[PDB]
Amino acid sequence: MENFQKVEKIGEGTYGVVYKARNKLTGEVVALKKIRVPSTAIREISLLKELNHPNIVKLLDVIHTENKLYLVFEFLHQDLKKFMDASALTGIPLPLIKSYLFQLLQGLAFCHSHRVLHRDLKPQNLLINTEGAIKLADFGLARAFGVPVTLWYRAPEILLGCKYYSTAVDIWSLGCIFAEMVTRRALFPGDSEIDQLFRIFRTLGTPDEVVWPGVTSMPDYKPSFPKWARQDFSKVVPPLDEDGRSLLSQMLHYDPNKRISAKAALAHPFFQDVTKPVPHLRL
Numbered sequence: 001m002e003n004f005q006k007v008e009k010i011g012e013g014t015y016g017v018v019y020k021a022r023n024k025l026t027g028e029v030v031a032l033k034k035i036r037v038p039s040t041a042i043r044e045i046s047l048l049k050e051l052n053h054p055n056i057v058k059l060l061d062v063i064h065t066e067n068k069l070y071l072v073f074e075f076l077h078q079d080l081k082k083f084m085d086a087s088a089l090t091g092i093p094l095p096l097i098k099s100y101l102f103q104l105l106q107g108l109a110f111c112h113s114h115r116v117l118h119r120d121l122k123p124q125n126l127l128i129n130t131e132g133a134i135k136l137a138d139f140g141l142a143r144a145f146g147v148p149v150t151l152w153y154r155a156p157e158i159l160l161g162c163k164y165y166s167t168a169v170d171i172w173s174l175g176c177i178f179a180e181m182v183t184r185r186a187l188f189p190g191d192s193e194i195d196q197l198f199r200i201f202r203t204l205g206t207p208d209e210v211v212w213p214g215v216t217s218m219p220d221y222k223p224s225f226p227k228w229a230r231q232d233f234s235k236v237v238p239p240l241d242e243d244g245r246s247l248l249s250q251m252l253h254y255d256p257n258k259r260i261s262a263k264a265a266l267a268h269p270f271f272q273d274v275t276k277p278v279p280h281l282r283l
């Protein structure tokens with residue numbers, strides 16, 4: 001640690017405090033996470049080090065010293081939440097929305113092909129740079145550190161008590177993030193688990209055995225849930241064109257087994273004309 005000089009409190013996250021810091025020998029500027037140590041975690045985290053991809057935030061080094069654990073990551077200058085706030089008046093140009101979505105789906109595809117998932121995607125762990133790239137941060141952590149189950153981006157199978165949920169839970173999250181980009185408002189802003197579910201049910205309809213076989217058998221399903229009708233997506237992400245809503249709709253399938261995968265989504269026609277614009281950033 002002594003090898004690092006803290007520059008500023010970036011913010012407080014899931015596993016602890018995140019600092020901007022400098023490596024006192026490489027001179028490299030990094031992001032330092034102090035994780036709040038079990039052998040299992042050290043081993044899992046050591047595997048995630050080898051996971052390298054242009055749309056995954058690079059885990060540079062793992063520092064285990066004095067009972068404590070620190071993760072050292074590649075540093076970027078802005079998270080997607082800051083960006084959207086900064087864009088609240090004008091919104092993000094579609095072509096940039098489309099670039100980001102496409103890059104994030106490449107990231108997900110990569111990690112999922114290795115059976116690694118995130119489980120907690122949110123705009124705050126989506127990081128952008130001046131060159132138009134976007135990258136996912138904190139992939140694989142939840143599983144390491146054994147983090148138990150912001151509810152705004154949680155998949156419905158997690159909320160219903162599925163203990164063995166899959167890569168599909170990340171697709172759900174990214175779909176929610178996609179909608180938020182387009183409209184500049186959160187899709188499902190729950191303030192408790194039940195509120196989260198119900199907001200989902202009010203928009204996509206209460207799930208049943210017709211749309212999601214097995215759902216009435218999930219541990220936290222109640223027959224007493226109110227039954228709401230489904231609303232049209234034309235009303236949920238309005239300006240979004242048809243290919244977009246089509247893709248969004250397949251990202252928000254209730255049935256985890258019918259939800260589109262990242263690899264198939266890359267093949268969606270909405271990406272036929274994809275480009276890589278650069279954003280206008282004030283750092």
Ligand SMILES: Nc1cc2[nH]cnc2c(OCC2CCCCC2)n1
Nearest residue numbers: 011012018031073074075076077124
């Ligand atoms: N610039 C930057 C680079 C990073 N590289 C890895 N993590 C990073 C991060 O986290 C900010 C995050 C936003 C919400 C709460 C603070 C943590 N910020």
